[PDB]
Design a protein around this ligand. Structure first.
Ligand code: XYL
Ligand code: XYL
Lengths: 249, 249
């Protein structure tokens, strides 16, 4: 019942989202303030917002700078980093910060910030055209998966920006595809077993390893209309994610 | 007061550990069973063991295969994966599994397994000589940092293998250096502020970003005898970690 709210100032990103995403989903072109201003005319709700910044919790750059300004600036950033323990958080981790404490500064119905670091520090882009998978498709998928897996069950909606497309340098076409795959897996719900979802992620990320593909899952693929041969050779740079998750599901 | 127990079957790894590590630390050359057999003559204690495997919790390969055999084989692996929720865990995350449940199968004083995935699946090495930092120094440091940060405070000792040196392919010389840096940071305790440790990690991993290097930390460097210029240009491939953390600390 959770609503997914995709928000980005780059029309390139928002257009791609519209084209890739099969109400349950909202796409907003503009800044965070713009999104909050438009949701107010209908907020007459609890939300979590994804902060895909750095390993230290500093809030600068693109989307995070917006959160920085929206929640109170420097004093807020200081409070935020302290909630994160003021220490180094590895890329691939996720930490939920409860803003409820503000009531004890508070701002709208946004109660949680899900900290999902995508870079140690923004000293350079993370993307490298030499290996799009390892530095593009994978990091964006992981950040999206983490955001979804750590989203508090009590929220009405999850606000997410165009992951790693800022200083990080991941091309929007790449970022949006991984974000779409993570969302398709999520929206599939229980229609796909937890184990088959594990297998789909494995092949999507190009880590083909048969021993981790149980017979029960092959049986499920046939039942679901998922072509096992195309799955085993899935190439994210050439194949449609629809092959992995038929819209029928 | 926690004891660090480094264990590896590769004498190359164990020798390097002895040379790099400044009782509080034990180095064992041999298999896990060998370590447990030798600790018994003195266990007349609670331990956590690091399992640096894959994103799915399967226990195969090197060190994990030893844990697999030690705890009960297939039935144990199945129980283990279920404790992990049976889902995909991103590299960079860490999950503590409590074996205490066995009492409700049980094996020695090992109460916890800290799951620290280092690869999605072992379909190929993670290391690439073209970028030793991103595929060698960084992943090993992150896995060690995660293991240390998630170690239950109630244990007497932490058992850790030669991280990412198996199928992963990280050279022992590289893996041991990052493991030594993480340990030096940890052993420094409160002698180095949490914020300066953040800065040291940043430069060690080669993400030089001045805005994240506060004046208070520069002041602390001078007090501690940490050369700020050598810090700003620290090159893990050429400089000694002693520059970052003088043994005086
Ligand atoms: O991490 C997401 C980035 O911050 C984006 O919001 C860019 O600033 C603009 O596409
Ligand atoms: O992850 C650590 C690896 O499993 C090692 O134990 C190798 O098997 C041997 O150096």
């Amino acid at each position: 019942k959770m609503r997914i709210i995709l928000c980005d100032t780059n029309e390139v990103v928002t257009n791609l989202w519209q084209e890739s995403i099969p109400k349950y989903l909202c796409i907003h072109h503009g800044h965070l303030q713009s999104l909050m201003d438009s949701m107010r005319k209908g907020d007459a709700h609890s939300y979590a917002i994804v902060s895909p910044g750095n390993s230290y919790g500093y809030l600068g750059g693109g989307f995070d700078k917006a959160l920085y300004n929206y929640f109170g600036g420097k004093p807020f950033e200081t409070w935020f980093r302290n909630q994160l323990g003021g220490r180094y958080h590895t890329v691939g981790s996720a930490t939920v910060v409860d803003l409820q404490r503000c009531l004890e500064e508070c701002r709208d119905g946004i109660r949680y910030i899900i900290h999902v670091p995508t870079v140690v520090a923004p000293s350079a882009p993370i993307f490298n055209p030499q290996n799009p998978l390892k530095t593009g498709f994978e990091p964006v998928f992981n950040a999206m998966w983490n955001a979804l897996m750590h989203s508090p069950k009590d929220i009405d909606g999850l606000i997410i920006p165009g992951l790693c497309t800022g200083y990080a340098g991941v091309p929007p076409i790449i970022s949006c595809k991984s974000m779409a795959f993570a969302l398709r897996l999520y929206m599939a719900g229980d229609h796909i077993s937890k184990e088959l979802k594990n297998v789909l992620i494995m092949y999507y990320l190009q880590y083909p390893f048969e021993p981790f593909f149980p017979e029960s899952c092959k049986i499920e693929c046939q039942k679901l209309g998922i072509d096992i041969e195309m799955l085993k050779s899935f190439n994210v740079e050439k194949d449609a994610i629809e092959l992995l998750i038929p819209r029928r599901i």
